[PDB]
């Protein structure tokens, strides 16, 4: 079962030149355990 979403987001208008990436999760009045099992990342920036 898959779900796909695509959007144009010109990142350069929104984030600084240098960023840290990561995951976030919260609970509030209601809750669930949130867990990541594996993670691969790759970025490339031409110069």
């Amino acid at each position: 079962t898959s779900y796909t979403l695509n959007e144009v987001v010109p990142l350069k208008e929104f984030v600084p030149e240098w960023v840290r990436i990561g995951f976030s999760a919260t609970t509030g009045a209601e809750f669930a355990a949130h867990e990541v099992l594996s993670w691969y990342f790759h970025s490339e920036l031409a110069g």
Partner: protein, 180 residues
């Protein structure tokens, strides 16, 4: 040219290449962002800064990330708030908890936030979520109010594999989640 790449297939008890914030920590070879308890936040950041664009050339990076995650709720009705993959300033710290997912503070576009997140939202917050009340995948830039959303049916305790990719030439951010 600059590239940064890494992969972690199994999380050890001391995963020193990650910055843990809030209650995030690693356990049973998983990164546990929250336990099933009320009102918590957990974040984990890769330790190296990533060069996403450069002002002297104007070039912008492509990137790809994939991860598997599990949301484990008691019953599929008592579940909140969700999970995010985000891109933020190097000094990012936990923001508001609950339905703001530890990454934003307002439904009002805040240019000083300069964080974009792809959320996997499990709880409908009437003030900003899609009216239909569904769980959804959304793209957020500088507010908890997604610029766009796709309804998603959570499969509780099931692993979801997601790929998120951004291509600088077309500025297109592509999110894909699959339950195998």
């Amino acid at each position: 040219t600059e590239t940064t790449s890494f992969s972690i297939t199994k999380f050890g008890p001391d995963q020193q290449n990650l910055i843990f914030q809030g209650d995030g920590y690693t356990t049973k070879e998983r990164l546990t962002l929250t336990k099933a308890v009320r009102n918590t936040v957990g974040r984990a950041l890769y330790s190296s800064p990533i060069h996403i664009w450069d002002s002297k050339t104007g070039n912008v990076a492509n990137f790809v990330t994939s991860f598997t995650f599990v949301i484990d709720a008691p019953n599929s009705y008592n579940v909140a708030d969700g999970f995010t993959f985000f891109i933020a300033p190097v000094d990012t710290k936990p923001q508001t908890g609950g339905g703001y997912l530890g990454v934003f503070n307002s439904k009002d576009y805040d240019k000083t936030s300069q964080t974009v997140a792809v959320e996997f939202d499990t709880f409908y917050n009437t003030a900003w979520d899609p009216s239909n009340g569904d769980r959804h995948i959304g793209i957020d830039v500088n507010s908890i109010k997604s610029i766009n959303t796709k309804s998603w049916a959570l499969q509780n305790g099931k692993e979801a594999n997601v790929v998120i990719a951004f291509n600088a030439a077309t500025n297109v951010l592509t999110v894909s989640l699959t339950y195998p």
